[PDB]
């Protein structure tokens, strides 16, 4: 199980970029109006 | 895909791993201490 956890390196990049862009967005907006 | 242009795709993951993360203390810290 080498090859199936921590081989997502290029995976994680894209997934990560699209989830993190719109965390950005949505903790700061979250933060602002808590 | 020229291939000079958009060939990038694995490149803008080192600098944004890098600076997407040095971010992710500071926008945090930032939108927390607003
Ligand atoms: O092989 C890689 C994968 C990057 C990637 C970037 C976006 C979408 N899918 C994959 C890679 C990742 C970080 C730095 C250099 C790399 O070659």
Redesign the interface.
Same mark, same amino acid.
């Given at each position: 199980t080498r090859g199936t956890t921590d081989n997502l390196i290029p995976v994680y990049?894209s997934i990560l +970029?699209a989830v =993190?862009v719109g965390l =950005?967005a949505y903790? +700061?907006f979250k933060?602002?109006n808590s």
């Open positions: 990049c +970029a =993190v =950005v903790i +700061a933060r602002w």
